[PDB]
Design a binder for this molecule. Sequence first.
Ligand SMILES: *C[C@@H](*)[C@H]1/C(=C/c2[nH]c(/C=C3N=C(/C=C4\NC(=O)C(CC)=C4C)C(C)=C\3CCC(=O)O)c(CCC(=O)O)c2C)NC(=O)[C@@H]1C
Ligand SMILES: *C[C@@H](*)[C@H]1/C(=C/c2[nH]c(/C=C3N=C(/C=C4\NC(=O)C(CC)=C4C)C(C)=C\3CCC(=O)O)c(CCC(=O)O)c2C)NC(=O)[C@@H]1C
Ligand SMILES: *[C@H](C)[C@H]1/C(=C/c2[nH]c(/C=C3N=C(/C=C4\NC(=O)C(CC)=C4C)C(C)=C\3CCC(=O)O)c(CCC(=O)O)c2C)NC(=O)[C@@H]1C
Ligand SMILES: *[C@H](C)[C@H]1/C(=C/c2[nH]c(/C=C3N=C(/C=C4\NC(=O)C(CC)=C4C)C(C)=C\3CCC(=O)O)c(CCC(=O)O)c2C)NC(=O)[C@@H]1C
Ligand SMILES: *[C@H](C)[C@H]1/C(=C/c2[nH]c(/C=C3N=C(/C=C4\NC(=O)C(CC)=C4C)C(C)=C\3CCC(=O)O)c(CCC(=O)O)c2C)NC(=O)[C@@H]1C
Ligand SMILES: *[C@H](C)[C@H]1/C(=C/c2[nH]c(/C=C3N=C(/C=C4\NC(=O)C(CC)=C4C)C(C)=C\3CCC(=O)O)c(CCC(=O)O)c2C)NC(=O)[C@@H]1C
Ligand SMILES: *[C@H](C)[C@H]1/C(=C/c2[nH]c(/C=C3N=C(/C=C4\NC(=O)C(CC)=C4C)C(C)=C\3CCC(=O)O)c(CCC(=O)O)c2C)NC(=O)[C@@H]1C
Ligand SMILES: *[C@H](C)[C@H]1/C(=C/c2[nH]c(/C=C3N=C(/C=C4\NC(=O)C(CC)=C4C)C(C)=C\3CCC(=O)O)c(CCC(=O)O)c2C)NC(=O)[C@@H]1C
Ligand SMILES: CCC1=C(C)/C(=C/C2=NC(=C\c3[nH]c(/C=C4\NC(=O)[C@H](C)[C@H]4CC)c(C)c3CCC(=O)O)/C(CCC(=O)O)=C2C)NC1=O
Lengths: 68, 161, 161, 161, 161, 160, 160, 160, 160, 240
Amino acid sequence: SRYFKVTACIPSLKRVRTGRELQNTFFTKLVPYENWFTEQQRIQKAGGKVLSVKLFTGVQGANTGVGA
Amino acid sequence: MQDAITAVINNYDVQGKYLDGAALDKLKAYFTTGAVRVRAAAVISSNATTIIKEAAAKALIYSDLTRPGGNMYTTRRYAACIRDMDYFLRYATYAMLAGDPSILDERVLNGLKETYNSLGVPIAATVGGIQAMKEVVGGLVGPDAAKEASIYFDYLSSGLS
Amino acid sequence: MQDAITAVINNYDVQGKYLDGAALDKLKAYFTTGAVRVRAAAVISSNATTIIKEAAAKALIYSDLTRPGGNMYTTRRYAACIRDMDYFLRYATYAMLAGDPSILDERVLNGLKETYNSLGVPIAATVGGIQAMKEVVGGLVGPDAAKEASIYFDYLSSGLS
Amino acid sequence: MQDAITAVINNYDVQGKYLDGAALDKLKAYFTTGAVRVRAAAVISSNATTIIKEAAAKALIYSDLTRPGGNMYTTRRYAACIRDMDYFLRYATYAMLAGDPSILDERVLNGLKETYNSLGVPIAATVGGIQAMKEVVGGLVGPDAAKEASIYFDYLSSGLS
Amino acid sequence: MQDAITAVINNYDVQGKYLDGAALDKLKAYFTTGAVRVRAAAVISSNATTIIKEAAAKALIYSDLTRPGGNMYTTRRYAACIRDMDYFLRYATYAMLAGDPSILDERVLNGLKETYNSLGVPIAATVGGIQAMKEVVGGLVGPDAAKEASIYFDYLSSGLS
Amino acid sequence: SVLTKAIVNADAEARYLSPGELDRIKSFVASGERRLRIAQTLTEARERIVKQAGDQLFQIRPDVVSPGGNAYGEKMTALCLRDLDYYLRLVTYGIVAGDVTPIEEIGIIGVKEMYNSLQTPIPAVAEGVRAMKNVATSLLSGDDAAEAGFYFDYLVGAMQ
Amino acid sequence: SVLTKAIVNADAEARYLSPGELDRIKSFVASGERRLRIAQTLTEARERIVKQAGDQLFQIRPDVVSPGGNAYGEKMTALCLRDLDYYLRLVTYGIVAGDVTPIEEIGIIGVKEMYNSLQTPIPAVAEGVRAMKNVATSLLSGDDAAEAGFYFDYLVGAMQ
Amino acid sequence: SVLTKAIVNADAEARYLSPGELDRIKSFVASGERRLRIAQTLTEARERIVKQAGDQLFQIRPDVVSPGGNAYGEKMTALCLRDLDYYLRLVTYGIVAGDVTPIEEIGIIGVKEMYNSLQTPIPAVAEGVRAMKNVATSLLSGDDAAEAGFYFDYLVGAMQ
Amino acid sequence: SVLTKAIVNADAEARYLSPGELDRIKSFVASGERRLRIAQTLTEARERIVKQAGDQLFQIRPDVVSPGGNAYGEKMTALCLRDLDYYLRLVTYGIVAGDVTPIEEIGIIGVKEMYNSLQTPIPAVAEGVRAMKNVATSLLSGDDAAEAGFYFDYLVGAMQ
Amino acid sequence: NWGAAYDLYNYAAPRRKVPQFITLFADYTQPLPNQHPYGAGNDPLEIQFGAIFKNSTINPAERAAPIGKDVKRILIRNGSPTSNERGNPTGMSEGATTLGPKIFKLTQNVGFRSKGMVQNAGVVTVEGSVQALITAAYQQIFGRQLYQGQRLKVAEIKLENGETTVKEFVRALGRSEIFRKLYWEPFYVCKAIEYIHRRLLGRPTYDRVENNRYFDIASKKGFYGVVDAMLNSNEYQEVF
Ligand SMILES: *C[C@@H](*)[C@H]1/C(=C/c2[nH]c(/C=C3N=C(/C=C4\NC(=O)C(CC)=C4C)C(C)=C\3CCC(=O)O)c(CCC(=O)O)c2C)NC(=O)[C@@H]1C
Ligand SMILES: *C[C@@H](*)[C@H]1/C(=C/c2[nH]c(/C=C3N=C(/C=C4\NC(=O)C(CC)=C4C)C(C)=C\3CCC(=O)O)c(CCC(=O)O)c2C)NC(=O)[C@@H]1C
Ligand SMILES: *[C@H](C)[C@H]1/C(=C/c2[nH]c(/C=C3N=C(/C=C4\NC(=O)C(CC)=C4C)C(C)=C\3CCC(=O)O)c(CCC(=O)O)c2C)NC(=O)[C@@H]1C
Ligand SMILES: *[C@H](C)[C@H]1/C(=C/c2[nH]c(/C=C3N=C(/C=C4\NC(=O)C(CC)=C4C)C(C)=C\3CCC(=O)O)c(CCC(=O)O)c2C)NC(=O)[C@@H]1C
Ligand SMILES: *[C@H](C)[C@H]1/C(=C/c2[nH]c(/C=C3N=C(/C=C4\NC(=O)C(CC)=C4C)C(C)=C\3CCC(=O)O)c(CCC(=O)O)c2C)NC(=O)[C@@H]1C
Ligand SMILES: *[C@H](C)[C@H]1/C(=C/c2[nH]c(/C=C3N=C(/C=C4\NC(=O)C(CC)=C4C)C(C)=C\3CCC(=O)O)c(CCC(=O)O)c2C)NC(=O)[C@@H]1C
Ligand SMILES: *[C@H](C)[C@H]1/C(=C/c2[nH]c(/C=C3N=C(/C=C4\NC(=O)C(CC)=C4C)C(C)=C\3CCC(=O)O)c(CCC(=O)O)c2C)NC(=O)[C@@H]1C
Ligand SMILES: *[C@H](C)[C@H]1/C(=C/c2[nH]c(/C=C3N=C(/C=C4\NC(=O)C(CC)=C4C)C(C)=C\3CCC(=O)O)c(CCC(=O)O)c2C)NC(=O)[C@@H]1C
Ligand SMILES: CCC1=C(C)/C(=C/C2=NC(=C\c3[nH]c(/C=C4\NC(=O)[C@H](C)[C@H]4CC)c(C)c3CCC(=O)O)/C(CCC(=O)O)=C2C)NC1=O
């Protein structure tokens, strides 16, 4: 059971949203290890930039104890 | 956020005190200027588009910003910039009505500086646009609410800078 | 999260070694105290709410923390503090059952310190409450599992401090 | 429907084979036990009402089933339950005579569980009644055909449950 | 879902009755055959794919089902038929472990027939495959759990038919 | 407050207030003097209301002041009266603010967890709040009595 | 039960049962005879256990049998004793089943809502369950006493 | 392990361990000495088991050591024997652990991808593990032989 | 209307209505007579308003009533005046309901698609609506004029 | 009429009250009825939190139809008609009218922002929109509020603290033990998928392909495979 501390900035170019998209554009969030791939690919395909990634939960080279 | 009444109420809450004479005259000081705030907010809401257009003409457009390589270049970026302009104006109106810049701090300024740094937006140009908005708003509203309007624009400019 | 057996297995697998006499001795040392851990965990699960009530009475309440201006003041903050209390107790029981503070590090301590710092939570008060559960649980469980229970509460207190 | 002989002959026909020694030995086993099944079926036919008699008295009546709110309450439901119980006894007799459960599967078991679910009939109570007649039939027929009779009642009970 | 023990417990709870001699006898009857079910379940779990392969070879493949115009023709339909076969095997193992077809009623047979009618799948061929897995599992497990395994495959076949 | 609620609604919708919020504000302001007067009256009569409400609550729930009760003893009864005073102060805050945001945040969110941890009868808290409502309504004119009883009834309902 | 829990866990992952689950099933089937013996031993003395637990609970918490108490009156006390008998029957069911699966659906989920609607002291019900546990363990050998007491304080923790 | 599987469920429900879970942990810690003895015996008879499984597997299907076979060559067969040793080590780990989670985290998760990339016969690997099962069973008492065979045929089912 | 909006929000939240929602309901029911009077005034002066709106519309945009114009011909101008009457009716409905819900359901959603299909100048229809706004506001007192002008302005803005 | 007639010939024929032969002879001369691609009993009742799923054994009303694989179902738009997404590819992104349900979007900062207010400030106004969104998430995923013990804490805590966004809290709710216990355990496998699809995404399934993609995942990974596959779709990120 590992997680990820991710900071990312997603700009929405063609939509032009009328009300308060600070919380949607730039954000930091915790994501599980098994979903970090899909979350990263979601950020990339929308033109976003992945500012930072941290482990925050696990150990670097665990062979065991990392089960979902 | 909070307004003047809520700020007084929770400031007495933290001491666990009933409403005293001091909270009474703070509440009366907020109450006595209610009508001027409402009239200036109505004027700003009725003239929102013209204020933004005049501020943009005075401080942003006819420059390198609107030319290629400028951050305000292209219709998408210009519309985003004017939307930010409307954001600042509307939240300044909200803060003026509530008599407290806590709404500006929470729903506007938090993370805006780092977001603009990451996106490449010119903070100095944005502050200039906000100040142009403040001059136009002070002209429109009149002496009665000029200082009350201008204080929150100054708060926004100080937070951005 | 890992247990004593899983920790030994990972420690030997990373070096690519089969289980030898030392690993077998460590596993035996864990196995010989299994029943006492289960009994003390059952006692703690049975008497969970009384332990939290006594710990709060001995450490937090009847002070300025519950009074106005106190961090634990208001029903929301009191409920949050007691929820944090029961979380600490439950994960202490889990760690004592597993014979390893890996779960305590993984699922409680990560982010807790800077979260408390941002929220203004009193770290000294929290450590005192955790210690209060420590001697209460030590009194309940008895000589058999008192030290084993106490080591994980001390782990939580040291991690917070 | 099918029985031992018809099942064996069709099983060899589908392949296209002559009836070999193993098939003749299965027909050996079926034919050597024939008269026991016939006398058991005669005993069951002669004592059918009394087998249902003791089966109902030992498994269904004098319980909450016959009191109001029970399923077997009222004369209509009592007559229907006894007719069903007789149906089970007669088809078990047919299966015992044939030496095959194909008739039970074809004409009793299909639609039965679904119909009982539709009407609210207690399947556990029905299985208990079937076991009751299994015990009674084992008492009546004696050592010769007790197991051969009981196997089809057990098949019916397992198919229902 | 429910096993034998949960079924007895529910049958007594609906009457609001403490456990008596009959319920104890039923529970003891389940208890005395616990180990054989576990051994058989381990055998099927170990030899899962071989059972499906032999069942398909004996009953399905090398026929018009796998030729053009067959329902098993094309890779998509072949994969679908084998995945259905695997579902039947796994839930048969669950039912044999639990001693109660209630899981088969709840999670497999409910609407399977009408789904197959909508899709055009041959129910007769499906029943043949289920029986083929039945004899294969009966050969693998041995006399100890042969009938206990076979009763649930027969239950699935009768539910489909 | 009414201003806070209207502002938060307009912000969430991303629009201005229009004559609507403008006049509702020009009124959440006309009733300000009456609300202040009612709050001042309740503050002046804070002790009498709390004492009478405690007395009436102990008549309907005698077991709370009893050997197996939460408030058994002089100090535990003093704590109950202090709780009633806290809720009266919160009701005064709600009356002055014009809505129930301060009451809900201060003493409603998590009060169930409060009294479950303390083993306190919440229905007896509700009965005490009702007693305070009756005592407070006895000291006010009809319109102001209904106005304060609205907030007291909200407290009673939310403490369920 | 143990079988239902293992089967549901396997079904969630869509896989056949692991060796650990088979081992726990073997342990359960081995302990099944002792579990049914303990259940019948508890069932034979159900009235004495209920009566003694009731008298112990009422001695501990006299307020519930007080004028303002929830269990005031002969009928109200009879209902409390009936609830205690219900929980004893649930404990016997759990003991035979080997897990908390049936009793969980029968009597703990929604128990807080039913007791809040009935205005009853949940800690008082827990104390009654503890008294029943003491009276029951007084009639059993030590190992079987611990085995029954596990389900007893399981109910105690659940009603919290 | 068993403790890990129980604690994961307890944390998922946000509740302390169920009485069935404590009983299962108690039985597992009781069986620990027998599990340690079995693991010690297999670790001591490691290399002989691997050698016998290796020359047993190539008789059922010698095509893998054929020119068109994946394990054609001395180093190719050395790698296969090393894989068999790896799986024997994983079986010994799982025997002590009491469940299959550490085995899964090391050798089962994503095992059908690396073997597909290497184009090795996974059914061949399954029969290879089965041969190891027979060789290991030949050196153990009946109960311990069945106990080890549970993990062995678990691996056989996993590579499938 | 306001009631529909408040009840919809409360139901979607699965909650009773907030005191702020009750206050806005009270304000809406209080203003009912004034809203009905404004609607009566507009309904009685509906025909003159439409005629004058047509006159200033045809003066401001004479190309609309021109040979290649969408509304050239006596019946095409009849349909234009009928559309103006429709929008005045929807404005009266919105004034009575206290919000813009009836206008949105009846005459705004899909207006872009309908007028694009019919090939009519949407800016021309917006100018006609503004002329209706001027003529209507010249027949009302200041507060009522602003109240009706809010709905007229929303109509003009939404047609954009 | 082979299948219909051999159902009538059975002795369970009187247990079926829905007429079958007039329906069958009418179906032969008309286009496909719109239902689930599987049997007509596979689509649950559309109430707030029911998940009814008529039994097909309590009272047989079995109805089948050859649906094939490329037949795309016709669904009514719960809102403005011109945003059906079949004639308007970008319709979930244009406005939000009063014709549909309320849309909850946590635009308030959350984050545990704090301020230049009192350090232990009592009121703090709006943190009841986080609480408003939390109780609304249950109203969508489960259809009703849960009981006291069943509520998932230590995910609402992270949402309130701002460590995770709404998309992560919804994933925690959907992958929860209670959701599986309610809407996965007691149902037929293809019924559970169809009901979970309506809860996690606002629409029933469109195609046999769409149903089969989740079915062939449920046969390999189980409940977590279905829920994870549903929450990781491109449609979820595009719409919500
Ligand atoms: C045929 C000309 C019509 C017309 C035009 C007009 N435009 C302006 C001012 C600006 N136009 C733009 C345009 C763009 N910026 C971009 O990034 C793009 C995409 C490539 C475009 C098209 C901008 C930015 C301005 C502002 C000034 C500047 O460029 O810095 C004006 C002047 C308006 C004013 O108030 O000064 C006019 C008149 N007017 C007509 O009547 C014609 C139909
Ligand atoms: C030690 C007794 C405690 C107590 C109890 C009390 N209970 C009631 C009323 C009811 N209790 C139940 C209980 C259950 N229904 C179930 O299905 C189960 C699970 C097996 C239980 C435990 C019910 C249904 C009722 C309502 C009446 C009925 O049974 O039909 C009452 C009466 C409350 C009233 O308002 O009348 C009491 C007092 N009270 C105490 O003080 C003890 C702690
Ligand atoms: C205008 C005076 C200046 C300017 C601005 C500019 N801004 C953007 C893009 C964004 N602006 C925002 C703003 C907000 N998001 C929120 O949540 C809130 C709360 C009300 C605010 C104020 C953000 C986050 C974005 C990025 C996402 C989006 O576009 O909506 C742009 C476009 C940048 C781009 O191309 O990605 C521009 C140009 N530019 C100038 O030249 C002026 C000085
Ligand atoms: C209690 C002994 C002390 C105390 C605590 C306090 N905590 C909060 C808020 C939070 N506490 C947590 C805790 C956890 N998150 C986790 O995941 C775990 C382990 C699984 C823990 C322990 C978090 C994340 C929060 C933030 C969200 C929330 O508020 O629920 C508060 C509230 C602060 C506020 O009002 O904003 C308080 C008061 N306070 C004391 O006085 C005690 C010493
Ligand atoms: C009494 C005047 C005569 C008599 C009766 C007698 N009855 C039984 C047993 C049963 N009677 C019933 C009756 C009914 N079930 C229904 O649903 C209805 C309709 C309302 C009736 C009338 C039933 C079900 C039973 C079985 C036991 C049970 O109820 O559970 C007996 C006992 C028979 C026995 O023990 O074998 C007797 C003696 N006997 C006389 O002499 C009178 C003429
Ligand atoms: C009796 C021990 C249990 C019981 C039974 C019960 N059955 C019915 C009704 C029917 N039973 C049948 C059964 C069959 N028809 C067949 O052709 C066959 C196989 C050849 C069987 C087994 C049918 C078709 C019916 C419905 C039509 C009819 O009534 O004849 C009832 C009546 C239900 C009602 O009132 O509607 C009952 C009570 N009930 C019990 O409690 C016993 C456990
Ligand atoms: C295989 C031995 C036989 C066979 C089967 C076959 N099945 C399908 C398609 C489906 N099968 C299912 C099955 C289930 N859904 C459930 O919930 C359960 C209980 C666990 C089962 C068993 C379903 C839902 C489908 C539909 C899949 C989809 O939507 O595409 C096919 C494919 C039919 C097609 O038209 O593609 C086949 C071929 N066919 C035979 O010949 C065998 C007798
Ligand atoms: C127009 C000439 C006639 C008419 C039509 C009308 N239709 C609707 C609403 C819907 N129409 C559809 C249609 C389809 N969806 C599909 O996928 C297909 C297959 C290509 C069709 C034909 C649907 C699904 C709806 C409802 C959902 C939606 O809006 O997308 C309306 C609106 C009804 C309302 O107000 O709710 C109307 C008016 N009406 C006439 O008078 C004409 C004869
Ligand atoms: C403003 C929000 C707020 C409240 C309300 C609050 C209440 C509060 N009530 C308390 C005690 C208490 N409260 C009660 C209350 C009751 N007993 C009954 O029978 C009834 C159900 C009820 C009275 C009608 C009791 C009995 C105690 C003592 C509990 C104990 O000593 O264990 C305590 C613990 C002692 C302390 O104050 O330090 C607190 C903090 N704190 C806050 O910040």
